Each structure stands twice: as C-alpha cells, then as structure tokens.
PDB file of C-alpha atoms in Angstrom:
ATOM      1  CA  UNK A   2      -0.013  -0.055   0.022  1.00  0.00           C
ATOM      2  CA  UNK A   3       3.195   2.151  -0.147  1.00  0.00           C
ATOM      3  CA  UNK A   4       2.041   4.405   2.719  1.00  0.00           C
ATOM      4  CA  UNK A   5      -1.522   5.500   1.564  1.00  0.00           C
ATOM      5  CA  UNK A   6      -0.641   9.263   1.493  1.00  0.00           C
ATOM      6  CA  UNK A   7      -3.859  11.333   2.116  1.00  0.00           C
ATOM      7  CA  UNK A   8      -3.111  13.914  -0.647  1.00  0.00           C
ATOM      8  CA  UNK A   9      -6.076  16.054  -0.058  1.00  0.00           C
ATOM      9  CA  UNK A  10      -5.059  17.631   3.174  1.00  0.00           C
ATOM     10  CA  UNK A  11      -6.405  21.002   2.020  1.00  0.00           C
ATOM     11  CA  UNK A  12      -5.113  22.367  -1.378  1.00  0.00           C
ATOM     12  CA  UNK A  13      -5.495  23.109  -5.041  1.00  0.00           C
ATOM     13  CA  UNK A  14      -5.168  19.755  -6.897  1.00  0.00           C
ATOM     14  CA  UNK A  15      -3.818  20.242 -10.413  1.00  0.00           C
ATOM     15  CA  UNK A  16      -3.919  16.985 -12.146  1.00  0.00           C
ATOM     16  CA  UNK A  17      -2.478  18.055 -15.476  1.00  0.00           C
ATOM     17  CA  UNK A  18       1.003  18.032 -14.052  1.00  0.00           C
ATOM     18  CA  UNK A  19       0.725  14.190 -14.023  1.00  0.00           C
ATOM     19  CA  UNK A  20       1.233  14.079 -17.703  1.00  0.00           C
ATOM     20  CA  UNK A  21       4.423  16.002 -17.363  1.00  0.00           C
ATOM     21  CA  UNK A  22       5.741  13.619 -14.655  1.00  0.00           C
ATOM     22  CA  UNK A  23       6.271  10.501 -16.906  1.00  0.00           C
ATOM     23  CA  UNK A  24       4.981   8.898 -20.047  1.00  0.00           C
ATOM     24  CA  UNK A  25       2.060   6.484 -19.085  1.00  0.00           C
ATOM     25  CA  UNK A  26       0.346   3.455 -20.651  1.00  0.00           C
ATOM     26  CA  UNK A  27      -2.543   3.361 -18.325  1.00  0.00           C
ATOM     27  CA  UNK A  28      -5.076   5.836 -16.807  1.00  0.00           C
ATOM     28  CA  UNK A  29      -8.320   4.131 -16.055  1.00  0.00           C
ATOM     29  CA  UNK A  30     -10.903   6.460 -14.410  1.00  0.00           C
ATOM     30  CA  UNK A  31     -14.223   5.263 -12.922  1.00  0.00           C
ATOM     31  CA  UNK A  32     -15.213   8.859 -12.454  1.00  0.00           C
ATOM     32  CA  UNK A  33     -14.295  11.739 -14.795  1.00  0.00           C
ATOM     33  CA  UNK A  34     -11.161  11.270 -16.890  1.00  0.00           C
ATOM     34  CA  UNK A  35     -10.729  15.081 -17.538  1.00  0.00           C
ATOM     35  CA  UNK A  36     -10.253  16.348 -13.971  1.00  0.00           C
ATOM     36  CA  UNK A  37     -13.829  18.589  -8.934  1.00  0.00           C
ATOM     37  CA  UNK A  38     -13.827  18.938  -5.169  1.00  0.00           C
ATOM     38  CA  UNK A  39     -13.863  15.508  -3.495  1.00  0.00           C
ATOM     39  CA  UNK A  40     -13.004  16.320   0.156  1.00  0.00           C
ATOM     40  CA  UNK A  41     -10.572  13.392   0.317  1.00  0.00           C
ATOM     41  CA  UNK A  42      -8.049  12.060  -2.188  1.00  0.00           C
ATOM     42  CA  UNK A  43      -6.529   8.993  -0.318  1.00  0.00           C
ATOM     43  CA  UNK A  44      -3.715   8.393  -2.754  1.00  0.00           C
ATOM     44  CA  UNK A  45      -1.666   5.364  -2.542  1.00  0.00           C
ATOM     45  CA  UNK A  46       0.799   3.487  -4.817  1.00  0.00           C
TER      46      UNK A  46
ATOM     47  CA  UNK B  30     -39.358  20.030 -46.188  1.00  0.00           C
ATOM     48  CA  UNK B  31     -40.176  20.651 -49.838  1.00  0.00           C
ATOM     49  CA  UNK B  32     -42.278  22.601 -52.322  1.00  0.00           C
ATOM     50  CA  UNK B  33     -42.812  22.200 -56.049  1.00  0.00           C
ATOM     51  CA  UNK B  34     -43.992  25.513 -57.646  1.00  0.00           C
ATOM     52  CA  UNK B  35     -45.162  25.180 -61.181  1.00  0.00           C
ATOM     53  CA  UNK B  36     -45.867  28.981 -61.155  1.00  0.00           C
ATOM     54  CA  UNK B  37     -42.323  33.514 -66.424  1.00  0.00           C
ATOM     55  CA  UNK B  38     -39.785  31.001 -67.626  1.00  0.00           C
ATOM     56  CA  UNK B  39     -36.842  32.421 -65.748  1.00  0.00           C
ATOM     57  CA  UNK B  40     -37.859  35.695 -63.809  1.00  0.00           C
ATOM     58  CA  UNK B  41     -39.050  35.382 -60.284  1.00  0.00           C
ATOM     59  CA  UNK B  42     -42.767  36.409 -59.713  1.00  0.00           C
ATOM     60  CA  UNK B  43     -41.914  37.668 -56.192  1.00  0.00           C
ATOM     61  CA  UNK B  44     -44.686  35.464 -54.925  1.00  0.00           C
ATOM     62  CA  UNK B  45     -45.160  33.558 -51.684  1.00  0.00           C
ATOM     63  CA  UNK B  46     -45.800  29.881 -50.813  1.00  0.00           C
ATOM     64  CA  UNK B  47     -45.197  27.481 -47.893  1.00  0.00           C
ATOM     65  CA  UNK B  48     -43.249  24.164 -47.865  1.00  0.00           C
ATOM     66  CA  UNK B  49     -45.121  21.203 -46.426  1.00  0.00           C
ATOM     67  CA  UNK B  50     -43.109  18.665 -44.433  1.00  0.00           C
ATOM     68  CA  UNK B  51     -41.994  15.835 -46.654  1.00  0.00           C
ATOM     69  CA  UNK B  52     -39.605  13.395 -44.870  1.00  0.00           C
ATOM     70  CA  UNK B  53     -38.195  12.676 -41.393  1.00  0.00           C
ATOM     71  CA  UNK B  54     -34.743  10.932 -41.282  1.00  0.00           C
ATOM     72  CA  UNK B  55     -33.672   9.579 -37.836  1.00  0.00           C
ATOM     73  CA  UNK B  56     -29.851   9.553 -38.610  1.00  0.00           C
ATOM     74  CA  UNK B  57     -28.292  11.131 -35.612  1.00  0.00           C
ATOM     75  CA  UNK B  58     -25.079  12.290 -37.270  1.00  0.00           C
ATOM     76  CA  UNK B  59     -23.171  15.542 -36.604  1.00  0.00           C
ATOM     77  CA  UNK B  60     -23.649  17.718 -39.801  1.00  0.00           C
ATOM     78  CA  UNK B  61     -21.608  20.985 -40.187  1.00  0.00           C
ATOM     79  CA  UNK B  62     -21.117  21.144 -44.053  1.00  0.00           C
ATOM     80  CA  UNK B  63     -22.766  19.942 -47.286  1.00  0.00           C
ATOM     81  CA  UNK B  64     -22.118  19.751 -50.958  1.00  0.00           C
ATOM     82  CA  UNK B  65     -24.420  19.338 -53.847  1.00  0.00           C
ATOM     83  CA  UNK B  66     -24.339  16.450 -56.428  1.00  0.00           C
ATOM     84  CA  UNK B  67     -24.261  17.063 -60.129  1.00  0.00           C
ATOM     85  CA  UNK B  68     -24.445  14.609 -63.111  1.00  0.00           C
TER      86      UNK B  68
ATOM     87  CA  UNK C   4     -14.639  -8.006 -24.704  1.00  0.00           C
ATOM     88  CA  UNK C   5     -16.998  -7.804 -27.733  1.00  0.00           C
ATOM     89  CA  UNK C   6     -18.857  -4.745 -26.202  1.00  0.00           C
ATOM     90  CA  UNK C   7     -16.908  -1.424 -26.481  1.00  0.00           C
ATOM     91  CA  UNK C   8     -17.663   1.736 -24.499  1.00  0.00           C
ATOM     92  CA  UNK C   9     -16.311   5.268 -24.950  1.00  0.00           C
ATOM     93  CA  UNK C  10     -14.475   6.852 -22.059  1.00  0.00           C
ATOM     94  CA  UNK C  11     -12.448   9.684 -23.743  1.00  0.00           C
ATOM     95  CA  UNK C  12     -14.135  12.305 -25.933  1.00  0.00           C
ATOM     96  CA  UNK C  13     -13.281  15.957 -26.893  1.00  0.00           C
ATOM     97  CA  UNK C  14     -16.813  17.221 -26.059  1.00  0.00           C
ATOM     98  CA  UNK C  15     -20.146  15.985 -25.032  1.00  0.00           C
ATOM     99  CA  UNK C  16     -22.708  14.427 -27.273  1.00  0.00           C
ATOM    100  CA  UNK C  17     -26.061  15.906 -28.177  1.00  0.00           C
ATOM    101  CA  UNK C  18     -29.294  13.938 -27.868  1.00  0.00           C
ATOM    102  CA  UNK C  19     -29.597  10.659 -29.817  1.00  0.00           C
ATOM    103  CA  UNK C  20     -26.165  11.139 -31.637  1.00  0.00           C
ATOM    104  CA  UNK C  21     -23.812   8.265 -32.311  1.00  0.00           C
ATOM    105  CA  UNK C  22     -20.014   8.343 -32.517  1.00  0.00           C
ATOM    106  CA  UNK C  23     -18.840   5.299 -34.368  1.00  0.00           C
ATOM    107  CA  UNK C  24     -15.100   6.274 -34.461  1.00  0.00           C
ATOM    108  CA  UNK C  25     -11.732   4.824 -33.463  1.00  0.00           C
ATOM    109  CA  UNK C  26      -9.662   7.900 -33.996  1.00  0.00           C
ATOM    110  CA  UNK C  27      -6.897   8.131 -31.419  1.00  0.00           C
ATOM    111  CA  UNK C  28      -7.673  10.643 -28.735  1.00  0.00           C
ATOM    112  CA  UNK C  29      -4.965  12.866 -27.307  1.00  0.00           C
ATOM    113  CA  UNK C  30      -5.372  13.332 -23.463  1.00  0.00           C
ATOM    114  CA  UNK C  31      -2.090  15.150 -22.590  1.00  0.00           C
ATOM    115  CA  UNK C  32      -0.491  18.295 -23.717  1.00  0.00           C
ATOM    116  CA  UNK C  33       2.265  17.095 -25.858  1.00  0.00           C
ATOM    117  CA  UNK C  34       1.141  16.486 -29.414  1.00  0.00           C
ATOM    118  CA  UNK C  35       1.140  12.802 -30.488  1.00  0.00           C
ATOM    119  CA  UNK C  36      -0.334  10.551 -33.148  1.00  0.00           C
ATOM    120  CA  UNK C  37      -1.070   6.806 -32.831  1.00  0.00           C
ATOM    121  CA  UNK C  38      -0.798   5.280 -29.406  1.00  0.00           C
ATOM    122  CA  UNK C  39       1.710   6.886 -27.169  1.00  0.00           C
ATOM    123  CA  UNK C  40       2.632   8.733 -23.954  1.00  0.00           C
ATOM    124  CA  UNK C  41      -0.347  11.134 -24.158  1.00  0.00           C
ATOM    125  CA  UNK C  42      -2.432   9.210 -26.814  1.00  0.00           C
ATOM    126  CA  UNK C  43      -5.031   6.598 -25.801  1.00  0.00           C
ATOM    127  CA  UNK C  44      -7.450   4.435 -27.826  1.00  0.00           C
ATOM    128  CA  UNK C  45     -10.848   6.153 -27.227  1.00  0.00           C
ATOM    129  CA  UNK C  46     -12.717   2.889 -26.641  1.00  0.00           C
ATOM    130  CA  UNK C  47     -12.453   0.297 -23.778  1.00  0.00           C
ATOM    131  CA  UNK C  48     -14.164  -2.963 -23.232  1.00  0.00           C
ATOM    132  CA  UNK C  49     -15.752  -4.537 -20.162  1.00  0.00           C
ATOM    133  CA  UNK C  50     -14.704  -8.198 -19.745  1.00  0.00           C
ATOM    134  CA  UNK C  51     -18.053  -9.205 -18.286  1.00  0.00           C
ATOM    135  CA  UNK C  52     -17.621 -12.310 -16.034  1.00  0.00           C
TER     136      UNK C  52
END
C-alpha cells in the first residue's frame, strides 16, 4: 500500500502535471477522466 | 421540407408559398457542411 | 470483450447522436499520433464475467 498518502489535506489539486511527470500506458478512471472537489484524495501506490 | 412551384420561364414572380413537411430521417449524425451532387 | 464503450472524447454528445469512431484521442498536452505517452485508444471493453 506504499503508505496511503492522504493527498487532499487542504489544497489546489492540479492533475495536469501528471502528464508532465512521466509517459504513461494506463489511466483508467471510474469517475471523470478530464479532472472537482472531492474532500478526500486517499492516494496510494 | 419541400415545395414544387409550377408558377415567367426564368424571372421570379416575387410570390409567396409554404413548404409542406416531406420526410423525417432519424440519422443522428453531426452535420456541419454539405455539398451538392451534379451529373 | 465484444462490447466497447467510449471513455474519452473531446466534447459532450447531443441527444440521440452516435459516435462510431476509433480515431486516437490525445489526453495530454504534448502532441502525439497513434498510441503513445499522451495518446490513448478512445474505446475500452468490459470483460463481463
């Protein structure tokens, strides 16, 4: 679970930087692929 | 919609008539441009 | 995997429109063509089990 960082804390979440981070082969969203206020992020890896 | 006006071989009479509905096509395709077809 | 669903599109559909197209969709900022770092196939299947 690589630490389950709770990303949300409080802050502006800019998701477009993720395309700049690395080339990807998968990005499967069950919500909205072009990305809202969600209160919690609960990121893990 | 269409009208046939047998109505002055070339000149316009500056008349007035309505087009009755003719055909309903349930295609569902995005249309932004069109072209005519000539023989 | 016979049933395909669209997950990525440039804009929303209008009522009763169809979009039978496989053209590669660019999701990221860097221009690309074909499959690649910022280019995804617009359709995905649900392997119903």
